Amino acid sequence: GHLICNLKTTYRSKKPAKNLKMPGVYYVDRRLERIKEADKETYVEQHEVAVARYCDLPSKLGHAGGTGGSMSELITENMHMKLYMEGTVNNHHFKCTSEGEGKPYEGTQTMRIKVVEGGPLPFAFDILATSFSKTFINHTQGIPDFFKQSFPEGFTWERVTTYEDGGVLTATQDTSLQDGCLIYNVKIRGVNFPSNGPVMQKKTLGWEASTEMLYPADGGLEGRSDMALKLV
């Protein structure tokens, strides 16, 4: 079976608004997969593929179009990332680091992750999966790319993930570009994960594929998604 959660996210550019070409309401389809783990999840490799689309269904009210996408020459066909993460789930403190690479225009990426403090964690690593990369979304289908456009200044995101069994996980993130490398700094605070639930019992088996709806809200973007966590 599955345990469901809901994500509510706000994405904020550090680039002045007058310099951003904004998208309309759009959708990002994703498949985030665990590729490898070692030593009770103190080492994890994750891969994600993410493709943006405007709704392609026919419209009876007429197609409202745009002026195609955006350009961001600071973001190359191949990019590397480095990440630092710190936080708490329930009463348990931890730190992680990761490094990876991907193809920002093709929407694919890999992260190799180490738990460097607080390991092994008392909770399923799956609940951290979405906190490890918005620059790697394929927006080539004519959608202005809020994320790639944000450079050199970069952007932040902030999110609340609400699990249907009481766990709540907030996360805040800073994304910068430094000497050609993307740098992520992430902070996590999760609370009220049930002691008898699959997260604290480590009885999860990764995420199903997902769709996120993104929409303009106050100069930035907000996102909404429901995700399904596979259970043992």
Residues that bind a copy of itself (CB under 8 A): 1-2, 4, 6, 8, 10, 12, 25, 27, 29-31, 33, 35, 47, 49, 51, 55-61, 87-88, 90-91, 156, 158-160, 164-166, 168, 170-172, 187-192, 194-196, 208-211, 213, 215-219, 222, 224-226, 228
Tell me how far apart the alpha carbons of residues 129 and 54 are, in angstroms, rounded to a whole number: 25
Q: Residue 217 in contact with residue 23, Cβ under 8 Å? A: no
Q: What is the DSSP string of 67-119?
A: ------TTS-SSEEEEEEEEEEETTEEEEEEEEEEEETTTTEEEEEEEEEESP
Which lies closer to a copy of itself via its Cβ, residue 59 or residue 67?
A: 59
What tokens were used for 121? 């964690």
Tell me how far apart the alpha carbons of residues 38 and 136 are, in angstroms, rounded to a whole number: 26
Which lies closer to a copy of itself via its Cβ, residue 116 or residue 168?
A: 168
Tell me how far apart the alpha carbons of residues 197 and 34 are, in angstroms, rounded to a whole number: 21
Please give the single-letter amino acid code of residue 32.
Answer: L
Please give the single-letter amino acid code of residue 149.
Answer: Q
Shortest gap between Cβ of 42 and a copy of itself (angstroms)? 21
Which lies closer to a copy of itself via its Cβ, residue 73 or residue 186?
A: 186
Shortest gap between Cβ of 7 and a copy of itself (angstroms)? 9
Place of tokens 């190799």: 112
Shortest gap between Cβ of 223 and a copy of itself (angstroms)? 9
Backbone angles phi, psi at 127, to 5 degrees: -70, -10
Tell me how far apart the alpha carbons of residues 131 and 125 are, in angstroms, rounded to a whole number: 11
Shortest gap between Cβ of 73 and a copy of itself (angstroms)? 26
Which lies closer to a copy of itself via its Cβ, residue 160 or residue 183?
A: 160
Shortest gap between Cβ of 79 and a copy of itself (angstroms)? 19
What tokens were used for 3? 């345990």
Which lies closer to a copy of itself via its Cβ, residue 169 or residue 182?
A: 169
Which lies closer to a copy of itself via its Cβ, residue 35 or residue 71?
A: 35
What tokens were used for 58? 């026919």
Tell me how far apart the alpha carbons of residues 173 and 200 are, in angstroms, rounded to a whole number: 24
Shortest gap between Cβ of 105 and a copy of itself (angstroms)? 15
Which lies closer to a copy of itself via its Cβ, residue 57 or residue 232?
A: 57
Spatial CB neighbours of 16, under 8 Å, sequence gap ≥ 6: none
Shortest gap between Cβ of 172 and a copy of itself (angstroms)? 5
